[PDB]
Design an enzyme around this catalytic site. Structure first.
Site, PDB file in Angstrom:
ATOM      1  N   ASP A 130       0.902  -1.151   0.000  1.00  0.00           N
ATOM      2  CA  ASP A 130       0.000   0.000   0.000  1.00  0.00           C
ATOM      3  C   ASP A 130       0.943   1.203   0.000  1.00  0.00           C
ATOM      4  O   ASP A 130       2.080   1.045   0.496  1.00  0.00           O
ATOM      5  CB  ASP A 130      -0.805  -0.065   1.306  1.00  0.00           C
ATOM      6  CG  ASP A 130      -1.649   1.157   1.571  1.00  0.00           C
ATOM      7  OD1 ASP A 130      -2.436   1.526   0.673  1.00  0.00           O
ATOM      8  OD2 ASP A 130      -1.529   1.719   2.690  1.00  0.00           O
ATOM      9  N   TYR A 155       0.023   5.212   0.522  1.00  0.00           N
ATOM     10  CA  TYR A 155      -0.283   6.263   1.484  1.00  0.00           C
ATOM     11  C   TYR A 155      -0.542   5.754   2.895  1.00  0.00           C
ATOM     12  O   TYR A 155      -1.466   4.992   3.149  1.00  0.00           O
ATOM     13  CB  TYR A 155      -1.504   7.075   1.016  1.00  0.00           C
ATOM     14  CG  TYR A 155      -1.320   7.613  -0.388  1.00  0.00           C
ATOM     15  CD1 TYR A 155      -0.395   8.616  -0.656  1.00  0.00           C
ATOM     16  CD2 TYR A 155      -2.105   7.144  -1.428  1.00  0.00           C
ATOM     17  CE1 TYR A 155      -0.236   9.101  -1.943  1.00  0.00           C
ATOM     18  CE2 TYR A 155      -1.964   7.622  -2.717  1.00  0.00           C
ATOM     19  CZ  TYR A 155      -1.023   8.602  -2.968  1.00  0.00           C
ATOM     20  OH  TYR A 155      -0.883   9.084  -4.248  1.00  0.00           O
ATOM     21  N   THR A 173       1.577   3.872   4.417  1.00  0.00           N
ATOM     22  CA  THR A 173       2.353   2.653   4.609  1.00  0.00           C
ATOM     23  C   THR A 173       3.824   2.869   4.266  1.00  0.00           C
ATOM     24  O   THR A 173       4.679   2.823   5.145  1.00  0.00           O
ATOM     25  CB  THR A 173       1.749   1.501   3.776  1.00  0.00           C
ATOM     26  OG1 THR A 173       0.427   1.274   4.290  1.00  0.00           O
ATOM     27  CG2 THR A 173       2.548   0.217   3.952  1.00  0.00           C
ATOM     28  N   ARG A 183      -6.933  13.837   5.303  1.00  0.00           N
ATOM     29  CA  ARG A 183      -6.684  12.403   5.118  1.00  0.00           C
ATOM     30  C   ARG A 183      -7.946  11.572   5.321  1.00  0.00           C
ATOM     31  O   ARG A 183      -8.253  10.666   4.527  1.00  0.00           O
ATOM     32  CB  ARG A 183      -5.532  11.904   5.996  1.00  0.00           C
ATOM     33  CG  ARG A 183      -5.380  10.385   6.044  1.00  0.00           C
ATOM     34  CD  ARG A 183      -4.943   9.790   4.709  1.00  0.00           C
ATOM     35  NE  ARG A 183      -4.705   8.345   4.809  1.00  0.00           N
ATOM     36  CZ  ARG A 183      -4.642   7.521   3.771  1.00  0.00           C
ATOM     37  NH1 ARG A 183      -4.786   7.969   2.524  1.00  0.00           N
ATOM     38  NH2 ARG A 183      -4.442   6.231   4.010  1.00  0.00           N
ATOM     39  N   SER A 219      -1.763   0.976  -5.061  1.00  0.00           N
ATOM     40  CA  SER A 219      -2.319   2.166  -4.442  1.00  0.00           C
ATOM     41  C   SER A 219      -3.544   2.733  -5.145  1.00  0.00           C
ATOM     42  O   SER A 219      -3.782   2.573  -6.351  1.00  0.00           O
ATOM     43  CB  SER A 219      -1.187   3.207  -4.440  1.00  0.00           C
ATOM     44  OG  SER A 219      -1.624   4.511  -4.071  1.00  0.00           O
ATOM     45  N   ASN A 220      -4.331   3.510  -4.393  1.00  0.00           N
ATOM     46  CA  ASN A 220      -5.451   4.291  -4.868  1.00  0.00           C
ATOM     47  C   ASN A 220      -4.976   5.463  -5.740  1.00  0.00           C
ATOM     48  O   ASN A 220      -5.702   5.980  -6.581  1.00  0.00           O
ATOM     49  CB  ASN A 220      -6.260   4.915  -3.726  1.00  0.00           C
ATOM     50  CG  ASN A 220      -7.130   3.971  -2.942  1.00  0.00           C
ATOM     51  OD1 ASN A 220      -7.543   2.920  -3.440  1.00  0.00           O
ATOM     52  ND2 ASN A 220      -7.444   4.299  -1.687  1.00  0.00           N
ATOM     53  N   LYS A 277      -9.635   0.838  -3.335  1.00  0.00           N
ATOM     54  CA  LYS A 277      -9.532  -0.208  -2.312  1.00  0.00           C
ATOM     55  C   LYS A 277     -10.600   0.103  -1.264  1.00  0.00           C
ATOM     56  O   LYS A 277     -10.912   1.286  -1.095  1.00  0.00           O
ATOM     57  CB  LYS A 277      -8.136  -0.250  -1.704  1.00  0.00           C
ATOM     58  CG  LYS A 277      -6.987  -0.540  -2.632  1.00  0.00           C
ATOM     59  CD  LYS A 277      -5.658  -0.817  -1.943  1.00  0.00           C
ATOM     60  CE  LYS A 277      -4.845   0.446  -1.668  1.00  0.00           C
ATOM     61  NZ  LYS A 277      -3.477   0.030  -1.170  1.00  0.00           N
ATOM     62  N   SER A 300       0.420  -3.425   4.448  1.00  0.00           N
ATOM     63  CA  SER A 300      -0.319  -2.186   4.683  1.00  0.00           C
ATOM     64  C   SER A 300      -0.295  -1.833   6.188  1.00  0.00           C
ATOM     65  O   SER A 300      -0.487  -2.703   7.033  1.00  0.00           O
ATOM     66  CB  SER A 300      -1.814  -2.295   4.311  1.00  0.00           C
ATOM     67  OG  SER A 300      -2.392  -0.980   4.235  1.00  0.00           O
ATOM     68  N   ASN A 336      -2.896   0.240   6.924  1.00  0.00           N
ATOM     69  CA  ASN A 336      -4.298   0.633   6.980  1.00  0.00           C
ATOM     70  C   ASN A 336      -5.238  -0.533   7.200  1.00  0.00           C
ATOM     71  O   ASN A 336      -5.339  -1.433   6.362  1.00  0.00           O
ATOM     72  CB  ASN A 336      -4.676   1.383   5.686  1.00  0.00           C
ATOM     73  CG  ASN A 336      -4.016   2.744   5.592  1.00  0.00           C
ATOM     74  OD1 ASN A 336      -4.418   3.632   6.361  1.00  0.00           O
ATOM     75  ND2 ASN A 336      -3.032   2.935   4.721  1.00  0.00           N
ATOM     76  N   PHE A 395      -8.480  -1.051   6.868  1.00  0.00           N
ATOM     77  CA  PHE A 395      -9.423  -1.416   5.795  1.00  0.00           C
ATOM     78  C   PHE A 395      -8.747  -2.146   4.630  1.00  0.00           C
ATOM     79  O   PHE A 395      -9.382  -2.924   3.919  1.00  0.00           O
ATOM     80  CB  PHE A 395     -10.156  -0.191   5.213  1.00  0.00           C
ATOM     81  CG  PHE A 395      -9.329   0.697   4.331  1.00  0.00           C
ATOM     82  CD1 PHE A 395      -8.555   1.704   4.879  1.00  0.00           C
ATOM     83  CD2 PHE A 395      -9.275   0.519   2.943  1.00  0.00           C
ATOM     84  CE1 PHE A 395      -7.764   2.529   4.095  1.00  0.00           C
ATOM     85  CE2 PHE A 395      -8.482   1.327   2.157  1.00  0.00           C
ATOM     86  CZ  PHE A 395      -7.725   2.342   2.732  1.00  0.00           C
ATOM     87  N   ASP A 396      -7.514  -1.788   4.357  1.00  0.00           N
ATOM     88  CA  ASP A 396      -6.729  -2.303   3.230  1.00  0.00           C
ATOM     89  C   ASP A 396      -6.197  -3.676   3.584  1.00  0.00           C
ATOM     90  O   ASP A 396      -6.217  -4.639   2.798  1.00  0.00           O
ATOM     91  CB  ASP A 396      -5.653  -1.280   2.909  1.00  0.00           C
ATOM     92  CG  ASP A 396      -4.889  -1.639   1.644  1.00  0.00           C
ATOM     93  OD1 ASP A 396      -5.481  -2.181   0.664  1.00  0.00           O
ATOM     94  OD2 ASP A 396      -3.686  -1.336   1.701  1.00  0.00           O
TER      95      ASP A 396
END
Lengths: 245, 245
Positions: B8, B10, B12, B39, B114-115, B147, B171, B173, B175-176
């Protein structure tokens, strides 16, 4: 042309801060924190379960969000505790003007479109004394998605027999206003927090926690289409339907 | 079995708090508030646009989230101010041990999932001098989802030719982490905030705003499958892989 008025439930007809007395028992001195994070995480989990294609009903989402929230404080509540405590979400106090608003709206068709599981909505509406105010209380559950997925808004036509253009969709939640607008309904947003008050609240020395949640959840979302109408309260709806474009 | 390490970006590999100077310039005395809300809203807008079926790339999402954030303070920035200020997201600093971790990971395949829109990721990776550290820098954009949508993780096999079981997804994050686990990857979570510290920070007097964002974004999410491994920093990955599961 407007044949039906369809309402979002949590945060629009019912006050999500009204679990405050019960959460202030899970952690004396941290009821306010718990109330905000629990709502925030309930919303996030609804979106993330749906985007992943891993639906679970709102009762499970509500309990999972509560577990996360209490977990941040160092607690590890068991399921029986979580299920008992999460019943607070089935007893939310309606906004004071909801009943007057819903009665003055008749003879329009009146309904709810909510993320809540069927049993949650039945209890919530009845506990509030509003079961006789709605022609239909629609849960997203049959679709296995959560707002603002378009299939959730598709249920309105299915259940009511009215098309998107004949529906006035009512919500205080910016993401829900955006999904409804995206789907094709006319939308009346309920804005209880004046933008100017929030700007000044944020500029006043101390940025309290409660202010942070207001800043995250009580405004129009920038990616979203604007609502057709914005009123400060539910009580203004009947008059809005009477003379507004 | 593990043939590729997919990260990931952002939060990470790159520090999202490193926009601090840019935000402090946008509103002296409110830089930390802006960083956090920007963010949070960037993440919400990515999920909500995807769930609505109204994708816009992460460059539009980032500026939309920034406009919202500056708007909560009562500002009304024009598009040029937003595009200019949003470039801070293309200049995020890598975590201090990222360079070293990546170097040690060759010759395994190394990638980013990544997004970030393709232009964004290109300029972010170049700026940190890490272009030669990756076999592929994958943007979700060709799938027009964000994601944790399953199609975002499907790009890893499309681009690298490795199956989910041969991939270690990395990650910070929650959720990720959940998205990647749902998809079938092996997952190593980077947990930079000890849970016990957060629990005490939150019970410690008034809750600061920064604590609220930590509480919302730095833990494992309760609806998600647990990651296979949890490490405190990127630098521990190489050793984790030689002795892994």
């Amino acid at each position: 042309m407007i044949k039906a008025v369809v309402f979002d439930a949590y945060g629009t007809l019912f006050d999500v801060q009204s679990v405050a007395d019960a959460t202030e028992r899970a952690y004396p001195g941290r009821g306010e924190y718990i109330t905000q994070v629990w709502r925030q995480k309930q919303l996030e989990y609804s979106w993330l379960r749906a985007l992943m294609g891993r639906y679970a009903d709102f009762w499970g989402v509500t309990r999972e969000a509560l577990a996360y929230t209490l977990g941040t404080l160092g607690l590890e509540p068991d399921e029986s505790f979580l299920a008992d405590m999460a019943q607070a979400y089935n007893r939310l106090t309606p906004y004071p003007d909801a009943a007057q608003c819903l009665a003055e709206l008749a003879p329009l068709k009146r309904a709810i479109l909510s993320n809540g599981a069927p049993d949650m909505l039945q209890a919530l509406v009845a506990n509030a004394g509003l079961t006789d105010s709605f022609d239909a209380v629609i849960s997203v559950d049959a679709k296995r998605v959560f707002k603002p997925h378009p299939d959730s808004y598709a249920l309105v036509e299915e259940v009511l027999g009215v098309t998107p253009a004949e529906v006035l969709f009512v919500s205080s939640n910016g993401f829900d206003v955006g999904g409804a607008k995206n789907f094709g309904f006319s939308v009346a947003r309920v804005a209880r927090l004046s933008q100017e008050a929030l700007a000044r609240e944020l500029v006043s020395g101390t940025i309290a926690p409660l202010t942070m949640f207001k800043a995250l959840r009580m405004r129009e979302e920038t990616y979203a289409e604007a609502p057709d109408f914005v009123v400060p309260a539910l009580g203004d709806l009947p008059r809005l339907v009477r003379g507004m474009a």
